[PDB]
Amino acid sequence: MENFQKVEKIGEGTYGVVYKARNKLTGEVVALKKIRTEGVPSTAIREISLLKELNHPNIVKLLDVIHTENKLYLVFEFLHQDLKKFMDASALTGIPLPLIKSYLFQLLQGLAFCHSHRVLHRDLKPQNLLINTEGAIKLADFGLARAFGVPVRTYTHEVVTLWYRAPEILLGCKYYSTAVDIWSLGCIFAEMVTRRALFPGDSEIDQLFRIFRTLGTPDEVVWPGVTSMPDYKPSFPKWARQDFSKVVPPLDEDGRSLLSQMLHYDPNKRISAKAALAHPFFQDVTKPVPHLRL
Numbered sequence: 001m002e003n004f005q006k007v008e009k010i011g012e013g014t015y016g017v018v019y020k021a022r023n024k025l026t027g028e029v030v031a032l033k034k035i036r037t038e039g040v041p042s043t044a045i046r047e048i049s050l051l052k053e054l055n056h057p058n059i060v061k062l063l064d065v066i067h068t069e070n071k072l073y074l075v076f077e078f079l080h081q082d083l084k085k086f087m088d089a090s091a092l093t094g095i096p097l098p099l100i101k102s103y104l105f106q107l108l109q110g111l112a113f114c115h116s117h118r119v120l121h122r123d124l125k126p127q128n129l130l131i132n133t134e135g136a137i138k139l140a141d142f143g144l145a146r147a148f149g150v151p152v153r154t155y156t157h158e159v160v161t162l163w164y165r166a167p168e169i170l171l172g173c174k175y176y177s178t179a180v181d182i183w184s185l186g187c188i189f190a191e192m193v194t195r196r197a198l199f200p201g202d203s204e205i206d207q208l209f210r211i212f213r214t215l216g217t218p219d220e221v222v223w224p225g226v227t228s229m230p231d232y233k234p235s236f237p238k239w240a241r242q243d244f245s246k247v248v249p250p251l252d253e254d255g256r257s258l259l260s261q262m263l264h265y266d267p268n269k270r271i272s273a274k275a276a277l278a279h280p281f282f283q284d285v286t287k288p289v290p291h292l293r294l
């Protein structure tokens with residue numbers, strides 16, 4: 001739209017390219033996501049319009065939706081940094097536990113809200129967790145996956161990462177639940193603590209096998225109904241569960257307890273966002289400011 005001047009390429013999501021841009025009338029700086037072309041499904045327009053209404057302090061505000069020349073621009077509030085870059089800048093020191101705790105709590109609030117409206121994120125990852133100078137963190141790209149069912153490649157066919165995908169998605173479950181977001185967030189929590197991705201799979205089977213190697217190969221004892229899943233194979237190798245203090249040292253017992261509940265195989269035993277907010281790990285939660293370099 002002629003109302004915006006591009007400032008710089010922010011990046012390239014699954015659906016299209018993101019630009020930092022300035023509104024010419026009001027002068028606000030925004031992030032513009034440009035999506036491409038059949039006439040744009042009317043279904044997607046309806047669904048994306050309902051996300052305009054999903055407002056919470058821990059969700060990146062969708063300002064406006066412009067459908068033009070049968071093309072789609074999503075206008076978001078702009079944040080100055082994402083968690084992936086903040087993790088990479090904290091690589092040698094690590095993020096302080098109070099700030100990890102604060103970010104985890106805030107995202108759980110975000111998720112509890114979206115989930116109480118039956119909106120799932122579906123593709124949570126450090127690059128879509130955005131942070132500001134005031135100690136906030138926000139969920140970005142919320143509900144877009146459901147608009148048009150995400151593939152495994154982007155617009156120049158860059159790779160969509162599998163590292164945060166819940167096992168039920170990987171095993172072919174079609175009707176997965178809000179629990180998939182909790183799994184992703186657990187994966188991110190572990191990565192903040194250890195400064196290494198928990199399950200860095202480079203294919204779906206490598207992603208599944210990395211999960212199995214750490215958490216044990218799932219069976220009917222831990223996950224009733226698992227062997228009836230579309231992509232479950234009797235022939236999966238049989239790995240025993242590793243002791244869990246091995247996975248996220250030097251995280252304390254409360255954090256390890258929460259993480260373990262976030263990473264339960266069975267989506268029905270996996271902790272809900274609302275329950276997680278009441279976990280003992282957050283008894284002493286605070287809201288520190290990060291020093292950000294912009």
Ligand SMILES: CC[C@H](CO)Nc1nc(NCc2ccccc2O)c2ncn(C(C)C)c2n1
Nearest residue numbers: 011012013018031076077078079080081128140
């Ligand atoms: C490539 C798009 C992703 C979406 O999570 N990055 C990103 N970074 C944002 N900000 C962080 C950032 C700042 C400066 C340079 C790159 C960069 O990603 C951002 N602010 C609003 N949005 C909307 C589209 C959600 C944003 N999206």
